[PDB]
Design a protein around this nucleic acid. Structure first.
Length: 268
RNA sequence: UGCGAAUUCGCUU
RNA sequence: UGCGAAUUCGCUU
């Protein structure tokens, strides 16, 4: 049997208005980045009507458009698409084929997949050898569209964070929030015993990547505790030298988290 | 919107 | 060894 390839078209048709931007976020139109997701099927898809997913940035209209049909794919290629599929749900979201598309005309982003398979920060936390002679080097560009994880805690279940702001006015030698430490560098030294080989780097603003499965629609003592918690998490200021960059870029992570909504919608 | 701890209560016959 | 409610605390920077 041949193949059918659909694009999951996303547009932010209604951006979050100021009065609903409680966590005062930056809005992120999906349509601003060319890479996105798609569905590879054996049987064709019945043209579903446009439907909204409610995301951090506003109301995104989802549309399922046909990209190709009646073509073939090699076993090796299917094995790759497949592995990726399992990776998206087991590792990215921690939950026939969902795969990434990208221009060169949208198409299967095999290279991107090859990079995910090749990256050392794809499953957990990679090791590094920063020394005085081989210092951590900060390239701003690597933190524009990025998702990072702390290298120094949660080995078994790494938390992942959107880079929300690069604070260039800050350094690990800037004053630390809590009184018990003079500086960021001291905090990580006294507490985690981490030495920094770069004391000029900017610091990072973060935003948790976690989401509610179901976004098809727009509080107890449980949200009352998860309040202060999730709030403190997003008030955390991170040091790049201490964070690994995730192979999946942020702007696609934003799109990936709409996937469980969309597939639920399509199966009904 | 998590990992845990304690305390006090509701639902069964 | 569940479904919920309230109260008070621990872990992040």
């Amino acid at each position: 049997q041949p193949c059918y390839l659909y694009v999951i078209g996303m547009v932010l048709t209604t951006p979050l208005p100021d009065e609903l931007n409680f966590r005062r976020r930056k809005l992120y139109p999906p349509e601003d980045t060319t890479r996105c997701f798609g569905i590879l099927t054996a049987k064709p898809i019945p043209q579903i009507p446009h439907f909204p997913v409610y995301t951090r940035s506003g109301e995104v209209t989802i549309s399922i458009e046909l990209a190709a049909s009646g073509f073939m794919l090699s076993l090796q290629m299917l094995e790759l698409i497949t592995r990726l599929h399992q990776y998206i749900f087991s590792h990215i979201l921690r939950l026939y084929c969902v795969l990434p598309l990208n221009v060169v005309t949208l198409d299967i982003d095999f290279k991107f997949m090859e990079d995910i398979e090749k990256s050392e920060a794809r499953i957990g936390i990679p090791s590094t050898k920063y020394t005085k002679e081989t210092p951590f080097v900060f390239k701003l560009e690597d933190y524009q569209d990025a998702v990072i994880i702390p290298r120094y805690r949660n080995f078994d279940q790494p938390h992942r964070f959107y880079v929300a702001d690069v604070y260039t006015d800050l350094t690990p030698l800037s004053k630390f929030p809590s009184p018990e430490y003079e500086t960021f560098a001291e905090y990580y030294k006294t507490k985690y015993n981490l030495d920094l080989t770069n004391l000029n780097q900017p610091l990072l603003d973060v935003d948790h990547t976690s989401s509610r499965l179901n976004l098809l629609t727009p509080l107890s003592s449980a949200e009352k505790r998860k309040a202060k918690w999730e709030s403190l998490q997003n008030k955390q200021i991170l040091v790049p030298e201490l964070c690994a960059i995730h192979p999946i870029p942020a702007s696609l992570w934003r799109k990936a988290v709409c996937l469980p909504s969309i597939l639920y919608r399509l199966h009904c």
